[PDB]
Ligand binder design. Structure first.
Ligand SMILES: Nc1ncnc2c1ncn2[C@@H]1O[C@H](COP(=O)(O)NP(=O)(O)OP(=O)(O)O)[C@@H](O)[C@H]1O
Ligand SMILES: Nc1ncnc2c1ncn2[C@@H]1O[C@H](COP(=O)(O)NP(=O)(O)OP(=O)(O)O)[C@@H](O)[C@H]1O
Ligand SMILES: [Mg+2]
Ligand SMILES: [Mg+2]
Lengths: 120, 120
């Protein structure tokens, strides 16, 4: 199973910081993204996932083991901070997790989609 | 002086890797971005810059010292790899470096713009 996780509307708070000349707020959000994907990457490892990347505001991973996915996403939901949520997609391969990720980014965000469910 | 540096068309090679189920190529480009912004952040420190963020595929920094900017950008240009260039903007504040950055992303990419020059 592949899972892609990625920050919602992250650009808006970064751009807001440039335009208001707020470098400290810009630096805080950059390291906060850095640290939250770190939290996400570690929760995933503890549940038998192999991280593919944990960089920028995203994390992609895969698990040849079994996994409670309402648990996993309920904890991704819980690293939200200051109006920045995370969306997730899941599929049987990287491409499918990607599409399902677009689906979430495309349907309210702060949500998870599963590729097999979209097709049906 | 503020400088914002950011990777061109980085999403296209990442997305290409999802859609072709090429996780190894996806992981390589993620760490390669990680490592190139590292190279950029270090060259800037050696020339008297203070890094504001070095994350994702970008680096923003400022220098209360003086700086040869054709040198600096000529070396940013030289960390290009596999058809991924970097654009830069410069200004007297964060907002201005941002606009000048959009200008470069907006005018061929693999290029630098200076905010004061745009206004004139
Ligand atoms: N850790 C980070 N440090 C600095 N900039 C980041 C970081 N993570 C993401 N970004 C920036 O945030 C943006 C991520 O690109 P996205 O295209 O993913 N857009 P975003 O608004 O963040 O949300 P979605 O549309 O995906 O829901 C780019 O501008 C990245 O350079
Ligand atoms: N180090 C990284 N690791 C993983 N994904 C990254 C990294 N740096 C950037 N990205 C992704 O690349 C994109 C950066 O957002 P951008 O909105 O900056 N778009 P890009 O096509 O990269 O070029 P420009 O339009 O800015 O010229 C987002 O999808 C990021 O999540
Ligand atoms: Mg995002
Ligand atoms: Mg970019």
């Amino acid at each position: 199973m592949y899972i892609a996780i990625d920050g919602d509307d992250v650009g808006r708070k970064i751009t807001s910081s440039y335009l208001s000349n707020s470098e400290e707020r810009l630096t805080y959000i950059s390291n906060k993204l850095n640290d939250t994907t770190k939290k996400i990457s570690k929760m995933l490892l503890s549940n038998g996932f192999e991280i593919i990347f944990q960089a920028a505001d995203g994390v992609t991973a895969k698990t040849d083991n079994e996994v409670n996915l309402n648990f996993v996403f309920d904890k991704i939901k819980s690293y939200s901070f200051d109006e920045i949520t995370f969306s997730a997609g899941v599929g049987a391969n990287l491409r499918e997790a990607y599409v399902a990720l677009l689906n979430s980014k495309s349907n309210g965000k702060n949500m998870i989609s599963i590729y097999k469910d979209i097709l049906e």
